[PDB]
Each structure stands twice: as structure tokens, then as C-alpha cells.
């Protein structure tokens, strides 16, 4: 696989292994802990159905090299939108200026090692015919419109990416990945008596578009998701004012795992903890969540959107237990922060592209299942909210305040789910909210393949998950 990627990224651009040696040597003229060369090429396609027609399509290409020079806290970085010897030389000569002092020049010999394959190397853009791709969108349109007469508009989009990466470093790392990513997105508008609402569904992962035609609980996945978007739109159309204030909230399984992404996940990224700016800094071994809570970041999940066969530093993805039975175990790392903390890489060194710096980032972040049934959880609430779906969230990792906003929610009254309620932003303190988790369900699932995470302006594909769970007290941003 490294051989195949090397042929496309190096040989095809007039580069050999010995050029990697030369360029790393240019970096190592300076007094550095580490330097790396990051090569990338990618292809993105999209198709969009709207107004019952194939309205739009795009094809986008990028390629480039990024070069870093690191000394302690410091990074010098330059990059170019081309893969060539001259681009590499120019980028190295700029990056290394981070330190004036000469180094000993003693790099480690480049040597690749095997890692577990997590996803195909088959290019998703070429593996299905154009008309077969467009037929997925046509089927979504037909099914959504047939699902309810109130459906007036359907926008359905297919996106696919095929990405090659290769990384070479002064510590001897030589590693490559072949990364497919597909997503089907559906949005519907419903109208009744002049009132309108919208609903959405979709997902995907690291494989070809055939996934969208495969079986999901006895139906074609694309059909199921078309129907889900309509169902969501109709629930919203019927929704009444949400209540305001502090109350019990039961969160559904899957994407409501945004809770974990915001309440602990960023707060456990090693850059914030190394600097001491996270609320979690210095807290390893302390209770940061209820004893019912084990939270992992897992880059090893076959075929998943959030997984990393290797991270962008060449570290194979790992199953990292962050919190175990409420107790903080450790932090997600990149090479830089791991060194400064006296720790080891974890497989969390991610960058949006060759044109951006890596940092510690999430992969698939989820809570392990517990002993309660979802029914037992709902029945425990006299008055509160049940929220099976969310939009996004946000976190201030210093003050430990986070939010996440519902996309489908209901009252619970006397242990039963009742009236649908309008979207509300929920707010809490991360640690305190995790400590309020009093019941954990036996129904873990991850999201369908929809997560995008933003940090320092860099967007990445991620996963979240959890079982159904109960937070005893959470502030609900309703009006009623």
C-alpha cells in the first residue's frame, strides 16, 4: 500500500526516497526535535438533486506538500500546492528558520511498519457508474415525496472523496494511507396550511457508494434515510414551545453523543492540557464523570467516517480509554504535545490538509454501554426532556461551559414521552454534567456518518456515540 501511494505521490512527481533524505537533512541542519514532510493528493466529487432534477455537480482536485520544523514548543511551517523537489526545498528552507542554531544532523533512518487496514483502497469515485450514483439521489427524491403529501421540496446530495497521503519524518516514520469518504445528505421541506418546516437525514463512511443501496433493517438504506428526513420535518412541524430551565434530560443513542464531544472530548485534547488551559489539566486520576461513565476515542473502527488507519503523523489509530468508570485516564496526543508532556503518541495527530498544522484531534468518541434499558431510563423521569437527535454544539474548554442544540425533542411526563418540543440549546458545565449522569443504557450506537469537528479553523470528519443516557439536571433553552 505504501508502495502504491509512493508511486503516485513520489515517483509520478519525479521524487525518490533519497529526495526525502535530502529534504529531511535540510531541516536537520538546525537544532530540532523533529521535522516532517507531508504529501497529499485528493479528489472530491459531488452531485445534487433538487426540484426533481440533477441540478448540479462538481469535481475538485488538490495536491501538495507541507513541511514542519519543531523545537520544543515551536513549529516552523511552510507548504505548497504542488508536489515537486523545488516545492519541498522551498518549504523546508522556510520552515527551518524557526531556529537559527545548528543541529547535530542525526536523523533516524526511514523505515515503514505495517498497520491494520481500516478501509478499502478502492477509489469510490470510479467504483460506481455515474447513472447508478444519480439513481441513488432519484430514489431518495421519489421515496421522500411518496412518504407524505405535505413534502414540497427535497434536496439530496452525494459527496465522495479519494485521498492519498504519505508522511516521512526525522524520527524514522515513513507511512501512507489511502482514504475514501462518502456522504449522502437529504433535506426536505414540508408545508401544511401555510406553515413550513424542514428535516434532514443522511450519513456514510469510508467505502464506496454501494453502502447507500445496502440493507438497513429490511429496507434499502437510501429509502430509510429519505423517510427519516420526512419524519423529522413532520415532527418539527408539530412541535410546541420547549420548557425553560433546569430539569432531567434523557439523551438518545448515537449522534446525541455530541454531549461527549463537547463536554469532555475537546477538553481532553493534549494541546490544551500541555498548556494548562483546559479545566482537565492536571486532573489525571480524578473523578471527572459519574462512575457509570467510560468514554473512549477510538480511531480503529473499520469503515467509519471518524477512523484513522494512520493519523497525519503516521501513528496508527488507537483505541484510547479517556475516562474509565468516571476516572480521568489521559489525553489525546500529537507528537509535539506528547513529547512536552512526557507521554506517547496516541493516534490523534490530525490536520485538515497539507496546508495546515496537525494538532491533537478526535476520531470516534463514545461512551460504553451500561445496564439500564432505554425504557427504564424514560420511565424514571416525572418531568423533563427526551432528545433523540441534535444539531451541533460548542465548548469553552477553559471555563468548562458547553452547549448542544436539539433537532428532535419531546417532553417526558410521568415516565412517558409525550409532546414534541421546539429546538432548544442545552447548556452545562462539562465535568458537572458528566457527574450528573445517573443511568447509562445498553443500546450503544454511533452516528450515521455525519460528524464535522472544528478547531483552530480546521474541519475534520469525526464520529460520536453513546447509549441512551440520563443527565439528572441540565439547563434547557426553551421559552415556556
Amino acid at each position: 500500500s505504501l508502495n502504491l501511494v509512493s508511486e503516485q505521490l513520489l515517483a509520478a512527481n519525479g521524487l525518490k526516497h533519497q529526495d526525502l533524505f535530502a529534504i529531511l537533512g535540510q531541516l536537520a541542519e538546525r537544532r530540532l526535535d523533529y521535522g516532517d514532510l507531508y504529501f497529499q493528493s485528493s479528489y472530491h466529487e459531488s452531485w445534487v438533486l433538487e426540484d426533481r432534477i440533477i441540478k448540479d455537480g462538481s469535481y475538485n482536485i488538490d495536491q501538495g506538500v507541507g513541511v514542519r520544523a519543531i523545537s520544543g514548543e515551536k513549529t516552523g511551517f511552510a507548504y505548497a500546492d504542488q508536489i515537486s523537489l523545488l516545492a519541498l526545498e522551498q518549504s523546508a528552507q522556510a520552515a527551518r528558520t524557526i531556529v537559527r542554531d545548528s543541529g547535530d544532523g542525526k536523523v533516524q533512518t526511514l523505515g515503514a511498519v505495517e498497520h491494520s487496514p481500516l478501509y478499502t483502497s478502492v477509489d469510490p469515485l470510479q467504483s460506481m457508474s455515474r447513472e447508478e450514483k444519480l439513481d441513488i439521489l432519484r430514489r431518495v427524491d421519489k421515496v421522500a415525496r411518496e412518504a407524505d403529501k405535505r413534502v414540497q421540496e427535497v434536496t439530496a446530495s452525494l459527496s465522495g472523496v479519494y485521498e492519498l497521503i504519505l508522511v516521512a519524518a526525522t524520527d524514522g516514520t515513513l507511512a501512507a494511507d489511502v482514504r475514501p469518504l462518502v456522504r449522502l445528505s437529504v433535506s426536505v421541506l414540508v408545508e401544511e396550511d401555510g406553515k413550513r418546516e424542514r428535516g434532514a437525514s443522511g450519513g456514510g463512511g469510508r467505502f464506496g457508494y454501494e453502502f447507500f443501496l445496502a440493507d438497513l433493517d429490511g429496507e434499502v438504506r437510501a429509502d430509510a434515510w429519505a423517510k427519516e428526513a420526512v419524519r423529522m420535518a413532520l415532527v418539527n412541524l408539530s412541535a410546541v414551545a420547549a420548557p425553560a430551565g433546569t430539569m432531567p434530560v434523557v439523551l438518545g443513542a448515537g449522534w446525541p453523543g455530541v454531549l461527549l464531544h463537547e463536554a469532555v472530548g475537546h477538553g481532553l485534547e493534549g494541546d490544551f492540557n500541555r498548556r494548562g488551559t483546559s479545566v482537565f489539566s492536571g486532573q489525571v486520576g480524578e473523578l471527572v464523570a459519574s462512575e457509570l461513565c467510560t468514554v473512549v476515542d477510538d480511531g480503529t473502527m473499520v469503515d467509519r467516517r471518524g477512523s484513522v488507519a494512520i493519523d497525519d503523523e503516521g501513528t496508527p489509530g488507537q483505541y484510547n480509554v479517556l475516562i474509565e468508570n468516571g476516572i480521568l485516564k489521559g489525553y489525546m496526543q500529537d507528537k509535539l504535545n506528547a513529547r512536552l508532556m512526557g507521554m506517547t503518541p496516541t493516534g490523534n495527530g490530525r490536520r485538515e490538509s497539507y496546508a495546515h498544522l496537525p494538532m491533537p484531534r478526535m476520531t470516534n468518541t463514545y461512551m460504553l454501554p451500561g445496564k439500564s434499558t432505554p425504557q427504564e431510563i424514560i420511565e424514571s423521569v416525572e418531568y423533563g426532556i427526551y432528545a433523540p437527535n441534535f444539531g451541533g454544539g460548542q465548548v469553552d474548554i477553559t471555563s468548562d461551559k458547553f452547549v448542544f442544540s436539539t433537532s428532535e425533542a419531546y417532553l417526558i411526563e410521568n415516565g412517558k414521552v409525550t409532546k414534541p418540543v421546539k429546538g432548544a440549546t442545552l447548556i452545562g458545565s462539562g465535568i458537572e454534567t458528566m457527574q450528573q449522569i445517573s443511568m447509562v443504557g445498553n443500546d450503544l450506537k454511533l452516528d450515521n456518518g455525519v460528524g464535522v469537528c472544528g478547531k483552530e479553523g480546521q474541519s475534520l470528519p469525526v464520529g460520536v456515540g453513546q447509549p441512551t443516557l440520563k443527565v439528572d439536571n441540565l439547563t434547557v433553552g426553551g421559552t415556556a
Partner: peptide, 4 residues
């Protein structure tokens, strides 16, 4: 920057 903001964190999502």
C-alpha cells in the same frame, strides 16, 4: 478560535 471557537471550538465545535
Amino acid at each position: 478560535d471557537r471550538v465545535y
